[PDB]
Ligand binder design. Structure first.
Ligand SMILES: [K+]
Ligand SMILES: [K+]
Ligand SMILES: [Zn+2]
Ligand SMILES: [Zn+2]
Ligand SMILES: [Zn+2]
Ligand SMILES: [Zn+2]
Lengths: 373, 373
């Protein structure tokens, strides 16, 4: 029978502090749960946001991480679609396929287990993690910063067994989110003129998506010009640094596109840039998609005139992908060379050096650092 | 040859004062212009707004009015599509049919004459109105509060000769705007749950559109319960007065619809209500359409979280209808009984009593007052 597993995990004991590599215990999977051996994981801006303590919903102690890939170690009772050995990717956006959201083609926001997930617990209201006599919380239903994690059986995507996990773990959030923002949320048409604010992992994926969709122009926008080279490699036709201008960035974009862009994407999480992204859109048919997650309490604003005269304000979560059915297809698109993933990896580290990944992100030198468990 | 015409018109010499019935001179139609004999007109909230003086770009003196219907009296050089005797409706939203906007299926905001129109002038930068030696400005390119008006030849919809002008003049703005907001901007699907804020002419037209689209639930929202009866007559499944609840109206609507509405429409021009309308929308797929025009400088706001979790913020102008090609079709839908127009008329007055139409505006079980020229 499935026994308790003693392994290593990067525990976040408290907000504002680095992660600590600890010996933890991972309980066996209960009914409709799956225990996964994490092979590779990466750090997303969101993991850092929660660790900072700025997240009102953040609770400690906790095992963070939501971009990962591994192998099913064991399954709980009732689980038949998955078995030991299956290659998988943990999902923070599950897909029960039965709730009103899963049944509605216009959304991917399954609500079946959100309450418990928000509390860092499995669907039955308890955690499978313990460390030095203390209960350790789950995070985003995935907790990938551990040699072994337990997730709800609806939070699992079974993928191509030949997929390189040290690469597809990135489809766990960043890449999928930006890519989906373009082809799912915006559904931009061939020839579209697009602007992408923020040239990090998500922004690059948006550009990637705009290129796949056939955009005629893709303008990258970032104050850090060191991000331009890679942005162009991904498809950006040109990049502009807001600091090189003495007028609001939206005015710059309107000027260089004769009215504004057809589609804009904010991939930073800055409400001011969000307003700018909307206002840089063309009158009559422009559409701006909010992809980044802004700090709590912060509000976006603009004059209703902007909407009345034709612009549309949208947002997206995990690129609008119905997770369980989509993630496997995204992996296949990677395997068939339709989308890029390898190009997103700028650094590689061992599990013990996971804090360097946070350091590299904060310093803005990297796009994605893959951590080998 | 076309002579100067001496006729009656309701002139607004200054803001805050009643319109004055004056005897004016209407110059003949210059190149690509059309002089129309106005048979019937009505007052829209926008006319009242401009007259109030609370409008920054509102100039004086001016001949207001933009909801009208009449007959072509004469046309200027180069006009071949229209001729004396044609039955028409003046358009504040043109359709030159050649600009980037007119050629784009996603918008109806022709820009060919926007600049001159905003200045109360014809395309050539001059006005065709004079009174007591003073030049009188045009308004919204229509100036229907006159026995005769002159408009750009692209601001004309040629309609069914059998149409009752004392009725279809309302298709000049109010009805068409609300109706189009539902079927063009929202494009709501059968069975949709809707909420309409503001139960005036525009609001009722939105309700009408929701019913035509097959909406299942249509909740009218207004602080004036006197507007509910007619709202139900037009199709509202129920009406609620925000003042009857302690909780913010969006929370009330979310509770009533188990999550929020599929589509909301703000038909008041209040940024606070626009925010409530958006937040009253269901997670994952809710859409809110701003139909009302807010006061200058005022802005709408919300937490980006609302968009990231699936809601969309939109707006509309004249219901998104390509004016010249759509108005004739709308007249035909009225003639074939697909939509209502007669039910919007709550009062009838003579031209000299036009000021009462404005008095009736500031309150009531009054929707539209048709002024017989
Ligand atoms: K689209
Ligand atoms: K729709
Ligand atoms: Zn993430
Ligand atoms: Zn579900
Ligand atoms: Zn045009
Ligand atoms: Zn109007």
């Amino acid at each position: 029978a499935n026994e308790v597993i003693k392994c290593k995990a990067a525990v976040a004991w408290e907000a504002g502090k680095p992660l600590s590599i600890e010996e933890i215990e991972v309980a066996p999977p209960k009914a409709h749960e799956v225990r996964i051996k994490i092979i590779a994981t990466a750090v997303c801006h969101t993991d850092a946001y929660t660790l900072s303590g700025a997240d009102p919903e953040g609770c400690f102690p906790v095992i963070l991480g939501h971009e990962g890939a591994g192998i099913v170690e064991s399954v709980g009772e009732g689980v038949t679609k998955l078995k030991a050995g299956d290659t998988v990717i943990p999902l923070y956006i599950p897909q029960c396929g039965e709730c009103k959201f899963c049944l509605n083609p216009k959304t991917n926001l399954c609500q079946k287990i959100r309450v418990t997930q928000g509390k860092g617990l499995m669907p039955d209201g308890t955690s499978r993690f313990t460390c030095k006599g203390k209960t350790i919380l789950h995070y985003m239903g995935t907790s990938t910063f551990s040699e072994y994690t337990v997730v709800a059986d609806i939070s699992v995507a079974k993928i191509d067994p030949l997929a390189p996990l040290d690469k597809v773990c990135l489809l766990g959030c960043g890449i999928s989110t930006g890519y989906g923002a373009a082809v799912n949320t915006a559904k931009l048409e061939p020839g579209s003129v697009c602007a992408v604010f923020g040239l990090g992992g998500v922004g690059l994926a948006v550009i990637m998506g705009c290129k796949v969709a056939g955009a005629s122009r893709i303008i990258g926008v970032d104050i850090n010009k060191d991000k331009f080279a890679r942005a162009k490699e991904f498809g950006a036709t040109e990049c502009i640094n807001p600091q090189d201008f003495s007028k609001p960035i939206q005015e710059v974009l309107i000027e260089m596109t004769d009215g504004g862009v057809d589609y804009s994407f904010e991939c930073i999480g800055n409400v001011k840039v969000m307003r700018a992204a909307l206002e840089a859109c063309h009158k009559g048919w422009g559409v701006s998609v909010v992809v980044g997650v802004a700090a709590s309490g912060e509000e976006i604003a603009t004059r209703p005139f902007q909407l009345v005269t034709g612009r549309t304000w949208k947002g997206t979560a995990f690129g609008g992908w119905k997770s369980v059915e989509s993630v496997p297809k995204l992996v296949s698109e990677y395997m068939s060379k339709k989308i890029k993933v390898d190009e997103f990896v700028t650094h590689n580290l061992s599990f013990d050096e996971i804090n360097k990944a946070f350091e590299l992100m904060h310093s803005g030198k990297s796009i994605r650092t893959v951590v080998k468990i």
